[PDB]
Amino acid sequence: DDIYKAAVEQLTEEQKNEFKAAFDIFVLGAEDGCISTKELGKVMRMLGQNPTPEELQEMIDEVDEDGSGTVDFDEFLVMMVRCMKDDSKGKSEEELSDLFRMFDKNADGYIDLDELKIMLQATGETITEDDIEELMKDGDKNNDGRIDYDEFLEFMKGVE
Template sequence: MSDEVLASIAESTGLDSEQIDALKKGFDGFDKEGAGTISETNMQMILKSMGIKVDKAEIENAAAEVDEEGTGKFSLTMFATVAARFMSEDDEEQMKEELKEAFRIYDRDGQGFITTDVLKEILREIDSTLTEDDLDNIIEEVDEDGSGTLDFDEFQEMMMG
């Protein structure tokens, strides 16, 4: 497998080299004849073995989109395209859980919001190079109603872009 092919997979899927490497290992394990393709069932098995939650109907839909000719055979690039959907959804779910946990920690009184002063503290911890002006601009942007507080949805939107 050439570096160019791996680079194009990374570019088109947004997966990092570790993730692509893991997919390639699984792919190679099922492509015993070296035909360069695997089946849809193999794709499901590889993803499950990697601990990625896969809904059968969802993978069938994703597979059908990349298998335009309906051959039922998937190259590594096609497999990575399908896998990327499930891998990034997984990451997003995990990130939401981590954000909920962080929000709970900073919402010390359990009121369902954090103050903009607490948000400034968080932002300073994340990036110590931010100036007071930077912080004020960020606060102005995320605290649209000027209430001086952020609920979880506003906090999540800011953190996830």
């Protein structure tokens, strides 16, 4: 899914530099993409995180959505961010709040399905009912039908 290239955007570059520096090691001799999934535990143990075999096996299943035991740099960066939210910096909560006043053109203190809709129309991106409600519930943590401001932060922190 799109969170792959999202992370490729979301991730910072000083990260991916040492990401490749450590990525250089997996080759057990003469490899060109034959990476295995039993080594997923070890490679998640390498890059600086502290993983546990439970999540190791889950990501063995949760990742390898291609099933080939392989992971793209896109998939690499996403399964970085989809667990460790090394996303596009989540610019702030308060720069976010000034963005949120423009979300609530109606000065709501909450992004409602209406404000969600109008703001995504201001993107030009059309309103499918899932879209806004996918955004609503992903932001409307209280499930009040609308995304209040901290709902918006936890919503759009780690977000460009």
